Design a protein around this ligand. Sequence first.
Ligand SMILES: NC(=O)C1=CN([C@@H]2O[C@H](COP(=O)(O)OP(=O)(O)OC[C@H]3O[C@@H](n4cnc5c(N)ncnc54)[C@H](OP(=O)(O)O)[C@@H]3O)[C@@H](O)[C@H]2O)C=CC1
Ligand SMILES: CC1=C(O)C(=O)CO1
Length: 321
Amino acid sequence: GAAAPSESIPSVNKAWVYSEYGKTSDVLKFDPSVAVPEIKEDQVLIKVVAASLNPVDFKRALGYFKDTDSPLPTIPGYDVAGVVVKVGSQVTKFKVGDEVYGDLNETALVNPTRFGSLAEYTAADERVLAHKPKNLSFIEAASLPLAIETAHEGLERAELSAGKSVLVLGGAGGVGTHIIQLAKHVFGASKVAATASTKKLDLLRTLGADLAIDYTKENFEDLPEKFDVVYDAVGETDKAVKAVKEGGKVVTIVGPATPPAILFVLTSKGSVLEKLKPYLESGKVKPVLDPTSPYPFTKVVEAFGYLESSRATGKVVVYPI
Ligand SMILES: NC(=O)C1=CN([C@@H]2O[C@H](COP(=O)(O)OP(=O)(O)OC[C@H]3O[C@@H](n4cnc5c(N)ncnc54)[C@H](OP(=O)(O)O)[C@@H]3O)[C@@H](O)[C@H]2O)C=CC1
Ligand SMILES: CC1=C(O)C(=O)CO1
């Protein structure tokens, strides 16, 4: 991994950009000639191969986090997989040519980068990245970071450990599909229950749920069964708190949190991906892609429109970029 020839790295590239806050159908535009970000000393420049979309991308573009956002215009996209083309002078973990993946923004809602992953090149902190598992495609790898790390962190915060039961509210989405898998296959849960609509129950069971609950036909909080952990990925802590055992833990990723539930926002860390590497290599934990993925780089507005419908099963990925 010797330095790339310097004239081989472009200073402008194609990207999607918004210059004002609003709906993606209104504000998100393609720009054929946007600056490539200059790297800091603890960053690498990545040739982007694929990018995933997350709800945070559209909530951020609506201006929900404006008070702690970076300056507009913004190139959206948190999740990235691609190939290192340049390394900063303080970088030790990666070299030119490494295949890497991660969620660009250490603190999702505080100073996310101006130069996201929906571009041909992006700059990423060493600390947020991991080596791409060899058995995963770039589409599959791009799908993982924000959602898998959110799932992992929430389960750790809930103190999930071997033998305990957990209920997942929103089991079929980007995050919930990993909450199920991790709970069963990484945290050793004895029983994993999860909510989704009628046609998605079989998927939940396939991913590791012992009990798939159709929220369109019954209310989980009225079940007499109560859980050691409840992980809300929808935004219904009012009910979630009614499903937990005395002394158990309720976490949510969608506030506001009704005590005793807690709301957190993930911290993006490559070390979490590295910890999960063996489960990804063995296929014990798998990427989960929406059947509509991948969306070509020309179809980013449509990819966002589909994610904004709240119906995605697993991940919406953009490729090729
Ligand atoms: N605080 C943090 O750190 C983070 C917060 N988030 C937030 O978490 C939420 C989920 O994110 P993500 O998984 O990426 O979202 P997705 O858009 O991937 O979730 C879509 C899934 O949500 C399911 N869903 C919708 N309503 C319900 C319901 N009432 N009960 C059960 N399932 C339901 C749908 O299944 P169906 O079609 O069957 O309804 C669909 O499969 C978002 O609001 C996101 O902003 C995400 C990541 C990090
Ligand atoms: C990543 C993330 C979201 O999606 C939120 O809603 C809050 O933080």
